[PDB]
Amino acid sequence: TRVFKKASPNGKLTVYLGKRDFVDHIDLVEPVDGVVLVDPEYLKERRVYVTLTCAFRYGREDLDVLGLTFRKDLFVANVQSFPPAPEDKKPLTRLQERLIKKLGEHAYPFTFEIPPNLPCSVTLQPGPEDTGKACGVDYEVKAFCAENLEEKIHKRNSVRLVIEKVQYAPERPGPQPTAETTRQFLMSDKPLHLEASLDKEIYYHGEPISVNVHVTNNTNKTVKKIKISVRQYADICLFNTAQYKCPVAMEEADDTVAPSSTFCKVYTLTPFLANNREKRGLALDGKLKHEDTNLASSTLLREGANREILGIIVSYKVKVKLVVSRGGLLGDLASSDVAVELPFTLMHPKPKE
Amino acid sequence: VQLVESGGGLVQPGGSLRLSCAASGFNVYSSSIHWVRQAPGKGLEWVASISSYYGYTYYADSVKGRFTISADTSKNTAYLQMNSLRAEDTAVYYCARSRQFWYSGLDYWGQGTLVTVSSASTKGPSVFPLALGCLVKDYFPEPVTVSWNSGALTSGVHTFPAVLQSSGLYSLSSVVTVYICNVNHKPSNTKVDKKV
Amino acid sequence: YXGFX
Amino acid sequence: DIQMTQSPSSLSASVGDRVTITCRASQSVSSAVAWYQQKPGKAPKLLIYSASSLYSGVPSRFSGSRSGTDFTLTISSLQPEDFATYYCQQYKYVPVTFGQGTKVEIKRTVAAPSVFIFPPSDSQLKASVVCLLNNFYPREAKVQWKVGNSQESVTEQDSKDSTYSLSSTLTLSKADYE
Amino acid sequence: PSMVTAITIMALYSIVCVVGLFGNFLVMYVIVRYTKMKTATNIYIFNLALADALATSTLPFQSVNYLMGTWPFGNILCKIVISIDYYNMFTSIFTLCTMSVDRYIAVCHPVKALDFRTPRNAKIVNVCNWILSSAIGLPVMFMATTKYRQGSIDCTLTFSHPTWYWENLLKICVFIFAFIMPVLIITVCYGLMILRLKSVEKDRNLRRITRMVLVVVAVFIVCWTPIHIYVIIKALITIPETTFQTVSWHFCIALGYTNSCLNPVLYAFLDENFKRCFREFCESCTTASSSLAK
């Protein structure tokens, strides 16, 4: 068994974490438990604290606007590791006991119970090179020696570890996505009717997505082209919540449906990161530092949860759009669009132990 | 659930090949594809790797500039084009698959294709007796089959692996002890019967 | 502005 | 570039014995070490990954372990189907490097080679002497010059007696031969 | 002659000229060589500094037009000066407005600002402002002939159309397009900015931001208002021409440029990245692993 360790720049205190990815179950999050090793001789009267912080960044690392930082702290939890506060009665995890046994008596535990309804680690890809700092939600564990909490804390006497709050695909599959639409343009005759569906609801990253499309063009109006697209929606909720849109994958077939006819087909679209490196602000899964990440996983939420979850909420839909070519007495080059939306879940399977 | 390799055979130094690895049951975007070669009587040496989810492409320092790996995602196939084939490229090439997300070793491997970059030509095995074994010389290319008494004493014979002689042409021997030995060269389709 | 005229 | 060194380069164990193969990494690969098994004429098969995790379907007798940069594959009760070459890959960094390989072989009592010498047939010199060690054990054996560089070939371990066989050829001149 | 009431005008047109040209040259140099124009705010500050320098370069021509009691230069000089003056007043104020709305969306709409604030978009906006002000500038340039007025050669604007109509047209359409649309945009955007900053140590930064935005809008409406009010007063009904009149009519013209003098102090030499650049002109361990025996 291995543990992750980091040390202060002066090397006095060092933080040990059993792992750096913490699974966020909908009901509760796995607690962040760890150990801090100090030396009471260095701390004449100082106290070492550990804080867990959920930081969301609005934009680029630069101030560049009036000298202010576009960085909110959505969640900050703090604990006084040393001296061991007699006030609390928190028990000791098995890994914490093993670390305290391994290290000396100068090893003191810390534990953080992350509350539910908090965002996971997502990073907004900025497309081309503009800044060296990523944009999105992150979780940070910060150990520091200080006389009191309200104090500017020295950078050589503090360790910071980036940890991960992750979610995995639900154990049980959900209902098969499906969508319907019945549309008539000038109400001449029986209308155009589009029906789309997916093969399943939960897909894994890299796995192809099959869209079964069925069109009954009962009117006299020809449809020329059919676009299937996989689109990522990033609800970046903040003060005055917004929503982001990005077409992640696309297949634009030139299949035509004659008037008063029928057309059934299956389109296979695979979303991958190779062709989405030029799209600024794309929700990526948010690794620890610059590393190999992928398109952000769908954020799972409770059925009766607070709709105003701060941070980035990721969703995925498949838009099936029939472009019906328009023209009557005067033949214009404009055309109408009949579209359906199929929501789906794009997640990582739970690791097998 | 299966990897099938094709495109290996006799080459000349400076020539080119194109090995194809068809992947059945795998998605090129949820898995990375590697080419690993094993030299005759040597260990495994990784050659190339492609990750279609990222468009990443890696080569070993001994094949950079010469070997190029690509993928046809529609057919779920991985191709390795080998140019400027040096004589040290004779090997058996396996196409292996790994999980794209959390690589956990090369789970699946193909049967492997033999690539031979010898500059020699197809020749016939000359048979010499040993007064009781036989030796076949200049038996290029491999394989070459041999059997005592046209298959009578098949159990009680020792056949040694073909050794690449100094000239490049191979050489093989077989022996039996308490007759006749028949030897067949398949690349040249030659049958020779000797009586010791 | 403001000068000339 | 990381060099992974396997020990021993070849070992001879018996059915039921506990076999241990050691793999030392030059640099520090954290746990990205896999153990693979290749039988002659067949593709390798993944046995363990992450230096401890058994691959799906692999018999439980195989087990991996790590201590620092020193990894170990242990077969608890060796079986006749568990005698092949074992390789040690490290996939922490690019390129991924493999070990030299450890060939597990069956153990038998020491056997005496049956040395034979065969001169070059007259139909050839119209030019290769050969020395033949028949059905010996263990693998290691030397050849004694008797009438340039001699080429030696050794078979696989015999399926019947778990023994070997060796043959060395030498092309000589007509000065000492006549 | 050079009496103490006749020299103060050259004092104004000299100190304002030197401070404007000097500050704008300093900030343009530090932006182009050191900061290298690698943001949207740097693009905006360089464009504003260029426009302000071009506007403030007109002052020597106006000062020596005053003292000489005439315009000594010539037809081409009279047109170039007048068009530079008008064009670059318009461009100065429009760049102020675009920078204000840029800060407004970078504060109130940060996630929209994340994609709508690329340096490509800043470059587009500058070109747009320049083209918008150019349309106004071209008529001014064409209609700015020199008439040998009896005793002078004075350089004025001549509208051979029904005169007292088009002159008041331009005089009021410079008072609405270059005074009240900007005083509306800046005030509105900075008000909404401080509202969204208050709707959320943080109070110290809020108070600093407020003390700076209020002084920005205050210096704008204190420099640019007197001359506009004064032109309106001069255009309603006549005024006596005396000492107070002829020194106030210049003190106002000099505040009009004093805005362009004080812009570097408020926008550039108050910026955080720019203060750093001006100063230039004048440790984290690695995450390892360790064993844990069971």
mmCIF file with all atom_site columns, N, CA and C in Angstrom, chain B residues 36 38 42-46 58 94 103-110 128-130 132 158-161 163 173 175 177, chain D residues 34 42-44 46 49 55 87 91 94-96 98 100 118-119 121 123-124 130 132 134 151-155 165-167:
data_model
loop_
_atom_site.group_PDB
_atom_site.id
_atom_site.type_symbol
_atom_site.label_atom_id
_atom_site.label_alt_id
_atom_site.label_comp_id
_atom_site.label_asym_id
_atom_site.label_entity_id
_atom_site.label_seq_id
_atom_site.pdbx_PDB_ins_code
_atom_site.Cartn_x
_atom_site.Cartn_y
_atom_site.Cartn_z
_atom_site.occupancy
_atom_site.B_iso_or_equiv
_atom_site.pdbx_formal_charge
_atom_site.auth_seq_id
_atom_site.auth_comp_id
_atom_site.auth_asym_id
_atom_site.auth_atom_id
_atom_site.pdbx_PDB_model_num
ATOM 1   N N  . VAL B 1 36  ? 4.294  -4.036  -30.986 1.00 0.00 ? 36  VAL B N  1
ATOM 2   C CA . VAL B 1 36  ? 5.426  -4.526  -30.209 1.00 0.00 ? 36  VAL B CA 1
ATOM 3   C C  . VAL B 1 36  ? 6.086  -5.649  -30.993 1.00 0.00 ? 36  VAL B C  1
ATOM 4   N N  . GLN B 1 38  ? 9.174  -8.672  -31.465 1.00 0.00 ? 38  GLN B N  1
ATOM 5   C CA . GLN B 1 38  ? 10.063 -9.605  -30.786 1.00 0.00 ? 38  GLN B CA 1
ATOM 6   C C  . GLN B 1 38  ? 11.046 -10.151 -31.807 1.00 0.00 ? 38  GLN B C  1
ATOM 7   N N  . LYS B 1 42  ? 14.762 -13.345 -28.940 1.00 0.00 ? 42  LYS B N  1
ATOM 8   C CA . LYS B 1 42  ? 15.023 -12.178 -28.108 1.00 0.00 ? 42  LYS B CA 1
ATOM 9   C C  . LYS B 1 42  ? 13.733 -11.808 -27.384 1.00 0.00 ? 42  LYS B C  1
ATOM 10  N N  . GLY B 1 43  ? 13.778 -10.710 -26.629 1.00 0.00 ? 43  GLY B N  1
ATOM 11  C CA . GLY B 1 43  ? 12.652 -10.269 -25.838 1.00 0.00 ? 43  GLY B CA 1
ATOM 12  C C  . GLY B 1 43  ? 11.741 -9.307  -26.587 1.00 0.00 ? 43  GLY B C  1
ATOM 13  N N  . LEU B 1 44  ? 10.699 -8.875  -25.882 1.00 0.00 ? 44  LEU B N  1
ATOM 14  C CA . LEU B 1 44  ? 9.709  -7.970  -26.447 1.00 0.00 ? 44  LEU B CA 1
ATOM 15  C C  . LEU B 1 44  ? 10.239 -6.545  -26.454 1.00 0.00 ? 44  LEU B C  1
ATOM 16  N N  . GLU B 1 45  ? 10.082 -5.862  -27.586 1.00 0.00 ? 45  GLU B N  1
ATOM 17  C CA . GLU B 1 45  ? 10.479 -4.468  -27.725 1.00 0.00 ? 45  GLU B CA 1
ATOM 18  C C  . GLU B 1 45  ? 9.311  -3.689  -28.304 1.00 0.00 ? 45  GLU B C  1
ATOM 19  N N  . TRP B 1 46  ? 8.845  -2.685  -27.569 1.00 0.00 ? 46  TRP B N  1
ATOM 20  C CA . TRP B 1 46  ? 7.746  -1.855  -28.040 1.00 0.00 ? 46  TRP B CA 1
ATOM 21  C C  . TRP B 1 46  ? 8.198  -0.996  -29.214 1.00 0.00 ? 46  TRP B C  1
ATOM 22  N N  . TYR B 1 58  ? 3.139  7.761   -30.771 1.00 0.00 ? 58  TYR B N  1
ATOM 23  C CA . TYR B 1 58  ? 4.464  7.609   -30.193 1.00 0.00 ? 58  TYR B CA 1
ATOM 24  C C  . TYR B 1 58  ? 5.218  6.495   -30.902 1.00 0.00 ? 58  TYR B C  1
ATOM 25  N N  . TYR B 1 94  ? 3.553  -7.984  -33.090 1.00 0.00 ? 94  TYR B N  1
ATOM 26  C CA . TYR B 1 94  ? 2.247  -8.172  -32.488 1.00 0.00 ? 94  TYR B CA 1
ATOM 27  C C  . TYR B 1 94  ? 1.556  -6.825  -32.350 1.00 0.00 ? 94  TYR B C  1
ATOM 28  N N  . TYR B 1 103 ? -5.071 2.990   -18.643 1.00 0.00 ? 103 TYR B N  1
ATOM 29  C CA . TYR B 1 103 ? -4.183 1.939   -19.132 1.00 0.00 ? 103 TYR B CA 1
ATOM 30  C C  . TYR B 1 103 ? -3.841 0.950   -18.024 1.00 0.00 ? 103 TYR B C  1
ATOM 31  N N  . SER B 1 104 ? -4.047 -0.339  -18.277 1.00 0.00 ? 104 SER B N  1
ATOM 32  C CA . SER B 1 104 ? -3.809 -1.392  -17.295 1.00 0.00 ? 104 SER B CA 1
ATOM 33  C C  . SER B 1 104 ? -3.108 -2.578  -17.944 1.00 0.00 ? 104 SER B C  1
ATOM 34  N N  . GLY B 1 105 ? -2.101 -2.296  -18.758 1.00 0.00 ? 105 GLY B N  1
ATOM 35  C CA . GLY B 1 105 ? -1.388 -3.329  -19.472 1.00 0.00 ? 105 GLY B CA 1
ATOM 36  C C  . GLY B 1 105 ? -2.046 -3.680  -20.796 1.00 0.00 ? 105 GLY B C  1
ATOM 37  N N  . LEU B 1 106 ? -1.295 -4.401  -21.623 1.00 0.00 ? 106 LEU B N  1
ATOM 38  C CA . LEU B 1 106 ? -1.767 -4.819  -22.941 1.00 0.00 ? 106 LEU B CA 1
ATOM 39  C C  . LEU B 1 106 ? -2.640 -6.055  -22.764 1.00 0.00 ? 106 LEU B C  1
ATOM 40  N N  . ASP B 1 107 ? -3.949 -5.822  -22.637 1.00 0.00 ? 107 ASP B N  1
ATOM 41  C CA . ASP B 1 107 ? -4.885 -6.899  -22.329 1.00 0.00 ? 107 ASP B CA 1
ATOM 42  C C  . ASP B 1 107 ? -4.955 -7.922  -23.456 1.00 0.00 ? 107 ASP B C  1
ATOM 43  N N  . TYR B 1 108 ? -5.054 -7.451  -24.693 1.00 0.00 ? 108 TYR B N  1
ATOM 44  C CA . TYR B 1 108 ? -5.250 -8.316  -25.845 1.00 0.00 ? 108 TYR B CA 1
ATOM 45  C C  . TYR B 1 108 ? -4.097 -8.152  -26.821 1.00 0.00 ? 108 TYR B C  1
ATOM 46  N N  . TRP B 1 109 ? -3.674 -9.263  -27.414 1.00 0.00 ? 109 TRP B N  1
ATOM 47  C CA . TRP B 1 109 ? -2.605 -9.270  -28.397 1.00 0.00 ? 109 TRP B CA 1
ATOM 48  C C  . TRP B 1 109 ? -3.009 -10.149 -29.571 1.00 0.00 ? 109 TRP B C  1
ATOM 49  N N  . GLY B 1 110 ? -2.437 -9.853  -30.734 1.00 0.00 ? 110 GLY B N  1
ATOM 50  C CA . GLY B 1 110 ? -2.662 -10.644 -31.920 1.00 0.00 ? 110 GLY B CA 1
ATOM 51  C C  . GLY B 1 110 ? -1.631 -11.751 -32.072 1.00 0.00 ? 110 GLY B C  1
ATOM 52  N N  . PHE B 1 128 ? 23.096 -33.044 -47.132 1.00 0.00 ? 128 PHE B N  1
ATOM 53  C CA . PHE B 1 128 ? 24.309 -33.806 -46.925 1.00 0.00 ? 128 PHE B CA 1
ATOM 54  C C  . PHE B 1 128 ? 24.106 -34.834 -45.818 1.00 0.00 ? 128 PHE B C  1
ATOM 55  N N  . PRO B 1 129 ? 24.545 -36.070 -46.025 1.00 0.00 ? 129 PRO B N  1
ATOM 56  C CA . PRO B 1 129 ? 24.410 -37.096 -44.989 1.00 0.00 ? 129 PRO B CA 1
ATOM 57  C C  . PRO B 1 129 ? 25.502 -36.970 -43.933 1.00 0.00 ? 129 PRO B C  1
ATOM 58  N N  . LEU B 1 130 ? 25.293 -37.683 -42.824 1.00 0.00 ? 130 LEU B N  1
ATOM 59  C CA . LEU B 1 130 ? 26.254 -37.707 -41.730 1.00 0.00 ? 130 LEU B CA 1
ATOM 60  C C  . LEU B 1 130 ? 26.663 -39.124 -41.344 1.00 0.00 ? 130 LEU B C  1
ATOM 61  N N  . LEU B 1 132 ? 23.225 -41.460 -37.228 1.00 0.00 ? 132 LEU B N  1
ATOM 62  C CA . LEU B 1 132 ? 22.756 -41.292 -38.598 1.00 0.00 ? 132 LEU B CA 1
ATOM 63  C C  . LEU B 1 132 ? 21.865 -40.062 -38.723 1.00 0.00 ? 132 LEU B C  1
ATOM 64  N N  . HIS B 1 158 ? 15.654 -36.028 -33.626 1.00 0.00 ? 158 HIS B N  1
ATOM 65  C CA . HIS B 1 158 ? 15.911 -34.694 -33.100 1.00 0.00 ? 158 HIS B CA 1
ATOM 66  C C  . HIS B 1 158 ? 16.186 -33.753 -34.262 1.00 0.00 ? 158 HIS B C  1
ATOM 67  N N  . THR B 1 159 ? 15.402 -32.683 -34.358 1.00 0.00 ? 159 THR B N  1
ATOM 68  C CA . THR B 1 159 ? 15.588 -31.664 -35.383 1.00 0.00 ? 159 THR B CA 1
ATOM 69  C C  . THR B 1 159 ? 15.965 -30.351 -34.709 1.00 0.00 ? 159 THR B C  1
ATOM 70  N N  . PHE B 1 160 ? 17.093 -29.776 -35.124 1.00 0.00 ? 160 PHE B N  1
ATOM 71  C CA . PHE B 1 160 ? 17.546 -28.552 -34.483 1.00 0.00 ? 160 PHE B CA 1
ATOM 72  C C  . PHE B 1 160 ? 16.989 -27.330 -35.206 1.00 0.00 ? 160 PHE B C  1
ATOM 73  N N  . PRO B 1 161 ? 16.760 -26.237 -34.481 1.00 0.00 ? 161 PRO B N  1
ATOM 74  C CA . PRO B 1 161 ? 16.243 -25.024 -35.120 1.00 0.00 ? 161 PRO B CA 1
ATOM 75  C C  . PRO B 1 161 ? 17.196 -24.507 -36.188 1.00 0.00 ? 161 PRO B C  1
ATOM 76  N N  . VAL B 1 163 ? 19.539 -22.250 -38.201 1.00 0.00 ? 163 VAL B N  1
ATOM 77  C CA . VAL B 1 163 ? 20.479 -21.205 -37.816 1.00 0.00 ? 163 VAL B CA 1
ATOM 78  C C  . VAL B 1 163 ? 20.815 -20.369 -39.042 1.00 0.00 ? 163 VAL B C  1
ATOM 79  N N  . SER B 1 173 ? 19.642 -29.102 -39.153 1.00 0.00 ? 173 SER B N  1
ATOM 80  C CA . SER B 1 173 ? 20.129 -30.467 -39.034 1.00 0.00 ? 173 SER B CA 1
ATOM 81  C C  . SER B 1 173 ? 19.085 -31.328 -38.338 1.00 0.00 ? 173 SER B C  1
ATOM 82  N N  . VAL B 1 175 ? 18.734 -35.680 -36.735 1.00 0.00 ? 175 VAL B N  1
ATOM 83  C CA . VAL B 1 175 ? 19.512 -36.855 -36.357 1.00 0.00 ? 175 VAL B CA 1
ATOM 84  C C  . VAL B 1 175 ? 18.570 -37.911 -35.800 1.00 0.00 ? 175 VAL B C  1
ATOM 85  N N  . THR B 1 177 ? 18.975 -42.193 -34.185 1.00 0.00 ? 177 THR B N  1
ATOM 86  C CA . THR B 1 177 ? 19.892 -43.262 -33.822 1.00 0.00 ? 177 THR B CA 1
ATOM 87  C C  . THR B 1 177 ? 19.100 -44.468 -33.335 1.00 0.00 ? 177 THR B C  1
ATOM 88  N N  . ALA D 2 34  ? 3.625  -4.255  -15.217 1.00 0.00 ? 34  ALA D N  1
ATOM 89  C CA . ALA D 2 34  ? 2.812  -5.396  -15.595 1.00 0.00 ? 34  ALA D CA 1
ATOM 90  C C  . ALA D 2 34  ? 3.700  -6.612  -15.813 1.00 0.00 ? 34  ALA D C  1
ATOM 91  N N  . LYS D 2 42  ? 3.713  -18.377 -29.391 1.00 0.00 ? 42  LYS D N  1
ATOM 92  C CA . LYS D 2 42  ? 2.423  -17.797 -29.052 1.00 0.00 ? 42  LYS D CA 1
ATOM 93  C C  . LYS D 2 42  ? 2.611  -16.369 -28.563 1.00 0.00 ? 42  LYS D C  1
ATOM 94  N N  . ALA D 2 43  ? 1.544  -15.585 -28.681 1.00 0.00 ? 43  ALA D N  1
ATOM 95  C CA . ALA D 2 43  ? 1.576  -14.204 -28.233 1.00 0.00 ? 43  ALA D CA 1
ATOM 96  C C  . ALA D 2 43  ? 1.611  -14.137 -26.707 1.00 0.00 ? 43  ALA D C  1
ATOM 97  N N  . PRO D 2 44  ? 2.177  -13.071 -26.146 1.00 0.00 ? 44  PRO D N  1
ATOM 98  C CA . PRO D 2 44  ? 2.183  -12.920 -24.688 1.00 0.00 ? 44  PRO D CA 1
ATOM 99  C C  . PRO D 2 44  ? 0.776  -12.753 -24.140 1.00 0.00 ? 44  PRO D C  1
ATOM 100 N N  . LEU D 2 46  ? -1.229 -11.169 -20.675 1.00 0.00 ? 46  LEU D N  1
ATOM 101 C CA . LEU D 2 46  ? -1.100 -10.383 -19.458 1.00 0.00 ? 46  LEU D CA 1
ATOM 102 C C  . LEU D 2 46  ? -1.442 -11.235 -18.245 1.00 0.00 ? 46  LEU D C  1
ATOM 103 N N  . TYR D 2 49  ? -1.139 -6.650  -13.475 1.00 0.00 ? 49  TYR D N  1
ATOM 104 C CA . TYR D 2 49  ? -0.942 -5.242  -13.779 1.00 0.00 ? 49  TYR D CA 1
ATOM 105 C C  . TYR D 2 49  ? -0.969 -4.454  -12.477 1.00 0.00 ? 49  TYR D C  1
ATOM 106 N N  . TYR D 2 55  ? -4.926 -9.971  -13.339 1.00 0.00 ? 55  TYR D N  1
ATOM 107 C CA . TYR D 2 55  ? -5.805 -9.812  -14.486 1.00 0.00 ? 55  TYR D CA 1
ATOM 108 C C  . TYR D 2 55  ? -6.946 -10.821 -14.414 1.00 0.00 ? 55  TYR D C  1
ATOM 109 N N  . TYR D 2 87  ? 7.765  -11.899 -18.712 1.00 0.00 ? 87  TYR D N  1
ATOM 110 C CA . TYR D 2 87  ? 8.273  -10.570 -19.016 1.00 0.00 ? 87  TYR D CA 1
ATOM 111 C C  . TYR D 2 87  ? 7.698  -9.541  -18.052 1.00 0.00 ? 87  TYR D C  1
ATOM 112 N N  . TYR D 2 91  ? 4.975  0.675   -17.603 1.00 0.00 ? 91  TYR D N  1
ATOM 113 C CA . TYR D 2 91  ? 4.209  1.606   -18.422 1.00 0.00 ? 91  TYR D CA 1
ATOM 114 C C  . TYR D 2 91  ? 4.002  2.957   -17.745 1.00 0.00 ? 91  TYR D C  1
ATOM 115 N N  . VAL D 2 94  ? 6.913  6.849   -21.353 1.00 0.00 ? 94  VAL D N  1
ATOM 116 C CA . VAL D 2 94  ? 7.133  6.505   -22.755 1.00 0.00 ? 94  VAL D CA 1
ATOM 117 C C  . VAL D 2 94  ? 8.625  6.637   -23.038 1.00 0.00 ? 94  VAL D C  1
ATOM 118 N N  . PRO D 2 95  ? 9.274  5.633   -23.647 1.00 0.00 ? 95  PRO D N  1
ATOM 119 C CA . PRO D 2 95  ? 8.703  4.369   -24.121 1.00 0.00 ? 95  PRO D CA 1
ATOM 120 C C  . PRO D 2 95  ? 8.447  3.358   -23.011 1.00 0.00 ? 95  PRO D C  1
ATOM 121 N N  . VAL D 2 96  ? 7.531  2.427   -23.254 1.00 0.00 ? 96  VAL D N  1
ATOM 122 C CA . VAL D 2 96  ? 7.301  1.321   -22.332 1.00 0.00 ? 96  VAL D CA 1
ATOM 123 C C  . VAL D 2 96  ? 8.364  0.260   -22.589 1.00 0.00 ? 96  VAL D C  1
ATOM 124 N N  . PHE D 2 98  ? 10.293 -3.481  -21.670 1.00 0.00 ? 98  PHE D N  1
ATOM 125 C CA . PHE D 2 98  ? 10.056 -4.840  -21.216 1.00 0.00 ? 98  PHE D CA 1
ATOM 126 C C  . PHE D 2 98  ? 11.336 -5.406  -20.623 1.00 0.00 ? 98  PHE D C  1
ATOM 127 N N  . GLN D 2 100 ? 14.069 -8.591  -19.911 1.00 0.00 ? 100 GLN D N  1
ATOM 128 C CA . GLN D 2 100 ? 14.722 -9.530  -20.815 1.00 0.00 ? 100 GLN D CA 1
ATOM 129 C C  . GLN D 2 100 ? 13.977 -10.856 -20.859 1.00 0.00 ? 100 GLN D C  1
ATOM 130 N N  . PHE D 2 118 ? 30.617 -36.192 -36.599 1.00 0.00 ? 118 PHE D N  1
ATOM 131 C CA . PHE D 2 118 ? 30.319 -36.566 -37.969 1.00 0.00 ? 118 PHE D CA 1
ATOM 132 C C  . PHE D 2 118 ? 31.189 -35.740 -38.910 1.00 0.00 ? 118 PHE D C  1
ATOM 133 N N  . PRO D 2 119 ? 31.962 -36.389 -39.776 1.00 0.00 ? 119 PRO D N  1
ATOM 134 C CA . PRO D 2 119 ? 32.816 -35.668 -40.719 1.00 0.00 ? 119 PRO D CA 1
ATOM 135 C C  . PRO D 2 119 ? 32.004 -35.139 -41.887 1.00 0.00 ? 119 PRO D C  1
ATOM 136 N N  . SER D 2 121 ? 30.553 -35.180 -45.466 1.00 0.00 ? 121 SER D N  1
ATOM 137 C CA . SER D 2 121 ? 30.335 -36.227 -46.453 1.00 0.00 ? 121 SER D CA 1
ATOM 138 C C  . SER D 2 121 ? 31.053 -35.894 -47.756 1.00 0.00 ? 121 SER D C  1
ATOM 139 N N  . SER D 2 123 ? 29.988 -36.148 -50.677 1.00 0.00 ? 123 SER D N  1
ATOM 140 C CA . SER D 2 123 ? 29.098 -35.443 -51.590 1.00 0.00 ? 123 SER D CA 1
ATOM 141 C C  . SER D 2 123 ? 29.057 -33.942 -51.333 1.00 0.00 ? 123 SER D C  1
ATOM 142 N N  . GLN D 2 124 ? 29.616 -33.474 -50.217 1.00 0.00 ? 124 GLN D N  1
ATOM 143 C CA . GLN D 2 124 ? 29.643 -32.056 -49.881 1.00 0.00 ? 124 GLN D CA 1
ATOM 144 C C  . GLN D 2 124 ? 30.957 -31.389 -50.266 1.00 0.00 ? 124 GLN D C  1
ATOM 145 N N  . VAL D 2 130 ? 30.479 -31.810 -37.754 1.00 0.00 ? 130 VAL D N  1
ATOM 146 C CA . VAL D 2 130 ? 29.440 -31.514 -36.773 1.00 0.00 ? 130 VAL D CA 1
ATOM 147 C C  . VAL D 2 130 ? 29.621 -32.383 -35.533 1.00 0.00 ? 130 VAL D C  1
ATOM 148 N N  . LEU D 2 132 ? 27.683 -33.530 -31.963 1.00 0.00 ? 132 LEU D N  1
ATOM 149 C CA . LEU D 2 132 ? 26.288 -33.702 -31.562 1.00 0.00 ? 132 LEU D CA 1
ATOM 150 C C  . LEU D 2 132 ? 26.228 -34.237 -30.134 1.00 0.00 ? 132 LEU D C  1
ATOM 151 N N  . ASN D 2 134 ? 23.683 -35.495 -27.467 1.00 0.00 ? 134 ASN D N  1
ATOM 152 C CA . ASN D 2 134 ? 22.343 -36.062 -27.560 1.00 0.00 ? 134 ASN D CA 1
ATOM 153 C C  . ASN D 2 134 ? 21.783 -36.303 -26.165 1.00 0.00 ? 134 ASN D C  1
ATOM 154 N N  . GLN D 2 151 ? 29.035 -22.869 -35.184 1.00 0.00 ? 151 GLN D N  1
ATOM 155 C CA . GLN D 2 151 ? 27.672 -22.420 -34.934 1.00 0.00 ? 151 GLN D CA 1
ATOM 156 C C  . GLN D 2 151 ? 26.933 -23.512 -34.172 1.00 0.00 ? 151 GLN D C  1
ATOM 157 N N  . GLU D 2 152 ? 26.359 -23.153 -33.027 1.00 0.00 ? 152 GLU D N  1
ATOM 158 C CA . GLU D 2 152 ? 25.702 -24.103 -32.143 1.00 0.00 ? 152 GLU D CA 1
ATOM 159 C C  . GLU D 2 152 ? 24.198 -23.865 -32.136 1.00 0.00 ? 152 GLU D C  1
ATOM 160 N N  . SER D 2 153 ? 23.440 -24.960 -32.132 1.00 0.00 ? 153 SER D N  1
ATOM 161 C CA . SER D 2 153 ? 21.988 -24.915 -32.063 1.00 0.00 ? 153 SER D CA 1
ATOM 162 C C  . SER D 2 153 ? 21.509 -25.903 -31.012 1.00 0.00 ? 153 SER D C  1
ATOM 163 N N  . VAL D 2 154 ? 20.559 -25.466 -30.191 1.00 0.00 ? 154 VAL D N  1
ATOM 164 C CA . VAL D 2 154 ? 20.008 -26.275 -29.112 1.00 0.00 ? 154 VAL D CA 1
ATOM 165 C C  . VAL D 2 154 ? 18.498 -26.348 -29.283 1.00 0.00 ? 154 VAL D C  1
ATOM 166 N N  . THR D 2 155 ? 17.941 -27.539 -29.085 1.00 0.00 ? 155 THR D N  1
ATOM 167 C CA . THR D 2 155 ? 16.504 -27.722 -29.197 1.00 0.00 ? 155 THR D CA 1
ATOM 168 C C  . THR D 2 155 ? 15.808 -27.199 -27.941 1.00 0.00 ? 155 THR D C  1
ATOM 169 N N  . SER D 2 165 ? 19.361 -31.079 -26.319 1.00 0.00 ? 165 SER D N  1
ATOM 170 C CA . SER D 2 165 ? 20.205 -31.620 -27.373 1.00 0.00 ? 165 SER D CA 1
ATOM 171 C C  . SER D 2 165 ? 20.902 -30.455 -28.054 1.00 0.00 ? 165 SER D C  1
ATOM 172 N N  . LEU D 2 166 ? 22.158 -30.667 -28.434 1.00 0.00 ? 166 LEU D N  1
ATOM 173 C CA . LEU D 2 166 ? 22.967 -29.589 -28.980 1.00 0.00 ? 166 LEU D CA 1
ATOM 174 C C  . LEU D 2 166 ? 23.724 -30.096 -30.196 1.00 0.00 ? 166 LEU D C  1
ATOM 175 N N  . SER D 2 167 ? 23.937 -29.202 -31.157 1.00 0.00 ? 167 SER D N  1
ATOM 176 C CA . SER D 2 167 ? 24.673 -29.547 -32.364 1.00 0.00 ? 167 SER D CA 1
ATOM 177 C C  . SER D 2 167 ? 25.500 -28.349 -32.800 1.00 0.00 ? 167 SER D C  1
#
